[PDB]
Scaffold this active site. Structure first.
Site, PDB file in Angstrom:
ATOM      1  N   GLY A  28       0.779  -1.234   0.000  1.00 17.26           N
ATOM      2  CA  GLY A  28       0.000   0.000   0.000  1.00 17.26           C
ATOM      3  C   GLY A  28       0.811   1.285   0.000  1.00 17.26           C
ATOM      4  O   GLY A  28       1.910   1.339   0.548  1.00 17.26           O
ATOM      5  N   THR A  31      -1.339   8.627   2.298  1.00 16.25           N
ATOM      6  CA  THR A  31      -0.880   9.728   3.169  1.00 16.25           C
ATOM      7  C   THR A  31      -0.249   9.235   4.482  1.00 16.25           C
ATOM      8  O   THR A  31       0.563   9.935   5.090  1.00 16.25           O
ATOM      9  CB  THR A  31      -2.020  10.716   3.500  1.00 16.25           C
ATOM     10  OG1 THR A  31      -3.111  10.012   4.107  1.00 16.25           O
ATOM     11  CG2 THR A  31      -2.506  11.421   2.232  1.00 16.25           C
ATOM     12  N   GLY A  33       1.829   6.778   4.387  1.00 16.00           N
ATOM     13  CA  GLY A  33       3.183   6.472   3.911  1.00 16.00           C
ATOM     14  C   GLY A  33       3.222   5.168   3.115  1.00 16.00           C
ATOM     15  O   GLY A  33       2.393   4.956   2.228  1.00 16.00           O
ATOM     16  N   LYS A  52       5.329  -0.365   8.194  1.00 21.80           N
ATOM     17  CA  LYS A  52       4.929   0.931   7.671  1.00 21.80           C
ATOM     18  C   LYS A  52       6.064   1.940   7.778  1.00 21.80           C
ATOM     19  O   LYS A  52       6.477   2.289   8.890  1.00 21.80           O
ATOM     20  CB  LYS A  52       3.699   1.483   8.410  1.00 21.80           C
ATOM     21  CG  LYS A  52       3.256   2.870   7.902  1.00 21.80           C
ATOM     22  CD  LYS A  52       1.821   3.209   8.268  1.00 21.80           C
ATOM     23  CE  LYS A  52       1.672   3.525   9.750  1.00 21.80           C
ATOM     24  NZ  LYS A  52       0.273   3.922  10.068  1.00 21.80           N
ATOM     25  N   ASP A 146     -11.358   9.602  11.751  1.00 22.18           N
ATOM     26  CA  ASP A 146     -11.492   9.353  10.305  1.00 22.18           C
ATOM     27  C   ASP A 146     -11.730   7.854  10.017  1.00 22.18           C
ATOM     28  O   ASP A 146     -10.986   7.208   9.262  1.00 22.18           O
ATOM     29  CB  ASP A 146     -10.265   9.899   9.549  1.00 22.18           C
ATOM     30  CG  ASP A 146     -10.474   9.975   8.034  1.00 22.18           C
ATOM     31  OD1 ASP A 146     -11.571  10.369   7.580  1.00 22.18           O
ATOM     32  OD2 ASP A 146      -9.524   9.648   7.291  1.00 22.18           O
TER      33      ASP A 146
END
Ligand SMILES: Cc1n[nH]c2ncc(C(=O)N3CCC[C@H]3c3ccc(Cl)cc3)cc12
Lengths: 336, 267
Positions: A28, A31, A33, A52, A146
């Site tokens: 992936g 935003t 990263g 990540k 979110d």
């Protein structure tokens, strides 16, 4: 800086590239990263790990929050931060999690794609674990801020098969399909109610395979509001009495007339997608998708809903032992 | 906004960063070759005041300043004063604390100007030369600070439990200003490394009642808490005010700083 202190630490410091194989294993980009599916080089185990690489160099606001909160938080339905690597050469931060093969974005997409040609027990079990995870966070005064299908992970084959993991604790504070109307009318703070509206939107989407407040891509967003009223109807004065206190209320009065949405309700929307308005599912959904945030159900109250006492009961493995038909994550060979 | 409120007993603060007094004293012995026990305490009072001043300049809330102070103390609880310059560590702790507390990323110019200005205008007695460090040094130091604390960033403080206690007394106007102020002073000591913050709050509240001559013995009696631990904290607070009296920071600190162990340079 003391030289002996410096070299002692440089010798002892575990480096991400020495401990983990992840070259060409990127799953992936966003935003958040760069996320990789990684394995241990010193093969003590054969487990899949999520690595990540955070956006930017150094410790961003987003990175501070995720590191700070996930260091503290521990719950079966919240993703666990296993380790943090600080790479001194390039000033890059790496976060190690356990690897989730699936998520709701991809599960939902699989079923939506089939409509050209979700089990109800799985829908209930997914919702229950989302509420459980968010209740735990809300109990610790942590807002996600979110919530969406893309950051609700589900574990694949392994000891945690079909367990929901809420991810992405980096929202430090474009499409707005999961954003509650108060935010769209200029609410200044994030709240627990805002997380619950998002869970309402996600639950509707699990039932229909369709984003309920889908819209074409300054907190006032006319077309997103228009879509919400086409689904929900326009709120009566008594339905949301503090709507007058919202900063964008005069703009709402300017751009909208109640009469446009006279035949619109959640009942009629969900009736079109073959969800029974008499169902316990629908009545729970309606309480999550309440327009006035103070009239919205809490996470604990939703978990105590008689929907979850009704057959079938929610299971800890959302797939319930049945074969997982959702594909594994493809690797990304894109340059950028 | 209130993140991890009520989770102290399951927290990294409690589980990793409530230290043993004798362990803390044992690690301190490497620096006690160069300084006396008195000189070490005075030095820690000094840097508490430096962090305070830096935070006032940047217009930060007390919780941010408190968190940065704890970060600083934890670092030198484990490592020597020679390892990293506390002149560099102090603004670095403030820089990291404002991110963690969601106040914001302080800009490159504002942070360095604040460090330069505060040490010139408020600490010229201790520091003859100007603030030598730049933003690359702060960012390097931020990586070391983050590694040493094992990414334990959420810190609990006595202010929230104190406010709760005085509201429960119904004596907010009378007691809070002094009790709050006594809590500020406890950061001059190691109390934040040795006791749960709610106990520090109760001891500060107790001293404020005794100072203001308020009878609250029945209220304190009804608490479910080990009162010997509270009395231990009270003794440190009383000892702090006696050291305060006998300490002239402005006259002494240049000489104390000259006695700090220096870093070993590279080959
Ligand atoms: C994958 C995976 N397994 N375990 C994980 N833990 C955390 C995260 C993550 O940081 N995030 C941030 C945004 C939503 C989530 C995510 C999910 C899927 C992908 Cl393609 C990339 C990133 C991913 C994984």
């Amino acid at each position: 800086m003391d030289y002996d202190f410096k070299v002692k630490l440089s010798s002892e410091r575990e480096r991400v590239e020495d401990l983990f194989e992840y070259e060409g294993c990127k799953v992936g980009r966003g935003t958040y990263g760069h996320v990789y599916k990684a394995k241990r080089k010193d093969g003590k185990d054969d487990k899949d790990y999520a690595l990540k690489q955070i956006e930017g160099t150094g410790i961003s606001m987003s990175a501070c929050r995720e590191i700070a909160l996930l260091r503290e938080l521990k719950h079966p339905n919240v993703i666990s931060l296993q380790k943090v690597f600080l790479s001194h050469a390039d000033r890059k931060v790496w976060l190690l999690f356990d690897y989730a093969e699936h998520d709701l974005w991809h599960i939902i997409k699989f079923h939506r794609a089939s409509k050209a040609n979700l089990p109800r027990g799985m829908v209930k079990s997914l919702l229950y674990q989302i509420l459980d995870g968010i209740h735990y966070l809300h109990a610790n005064w942590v807002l996600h801020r979110d919530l969406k299908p893309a950051n609700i992970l589900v574990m694949g084959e392994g000891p945690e098969r079909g367990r929901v993991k809420i991810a992405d604790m980096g929202f430090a504070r474009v499409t707005f399909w999961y954003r509650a109307p108060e935010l769209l009318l200029g609410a200044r703070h994030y709240t627990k109610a805002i997380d619950i509206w998002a869970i309402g939107c996600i639950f509707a989407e699990l039932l229909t395979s369709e984003p309920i407040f889908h819209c074409r891509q300054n907190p006032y967003h006319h077309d997103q509001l228009d879509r919400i009223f086409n689904v929900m109807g326009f709120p009566a004065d008594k339905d949301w009495e503090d709507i007058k206190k919202m900063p964008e209320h005069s703009t709402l009065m300017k751009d909208f007339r109640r009469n446009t949405y006279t035949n619109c309700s959640l009942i009629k929307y969900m009736e079109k997608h073959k969800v029974k308005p008499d169902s316990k599912a629908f009545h729970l959904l309606q309480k999550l998708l309440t327009m006035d945030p103070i009239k919205r159900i809490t996470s604990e109250q939703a978990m105590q809903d008689p929907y979850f006492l009704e057959d079938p009961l929610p299971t800890s493995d959302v797939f319930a032992g049945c074969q997982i038909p959702y594909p594994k994550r493809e690797f990304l060979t894109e340059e950028e | 906004d209130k993140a991890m409120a009520g989770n102290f007993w399951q927290s990294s603060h409690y589980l990793q960063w409530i230290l043993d007094k004798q362990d803390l004293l044992k690690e301190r012995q490497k620096d006690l070759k160069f300084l006396s026990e008195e000189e070490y305490w005075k030095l820690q009072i000094f840097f508490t005041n430096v962090i305070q001043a830096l935070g006032e300049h940047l217009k930060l809330r007390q919780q941010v300043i408190a968190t940065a102070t704890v970060y600083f103390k934890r670092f030198y609880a484990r490592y020597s004063l020679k390892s990293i310059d506390p002149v560099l560590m102090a603004p670095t702790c403030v820089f990291l604390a404002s991110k963690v507390e969601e106040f914001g990323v302080v800009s490159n110019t504002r942070l360095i100007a604040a460090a330069t200005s505060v040490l010139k205008t408020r600490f010229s007695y201790a520091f003859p030369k100007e603030f030598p460090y730049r933003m690359n040094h702060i960012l390097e130091c931020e990586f070391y600070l983050l590694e040493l604390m094992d990414c334990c960033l959420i810190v609990y403080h006595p202010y929230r439990p104190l406010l709760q206690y005085v509201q429960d007394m119904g004596q907010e106007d009378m007691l809070l200003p002094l009790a709050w102020r006594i809590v500020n002073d406890t950061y001059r000591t190691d109390l934040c490394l040795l006791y749960p913050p709610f106990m520090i709050a109760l001891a500060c509240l107790h001293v404020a009642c005794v100072v203001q001559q308020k009878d609250a013995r029945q209220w304190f009696a009804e608490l479910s808490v080990d009162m010997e631990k509270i009395l231990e904290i009270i003794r440190v607070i009383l000892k702090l005010y006696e050291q305060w009296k006998n300490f002239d920071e402005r006259k002494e600190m240049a000489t104390i700083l000259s006695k700090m162990p220096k870093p070993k340079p590279p080959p």
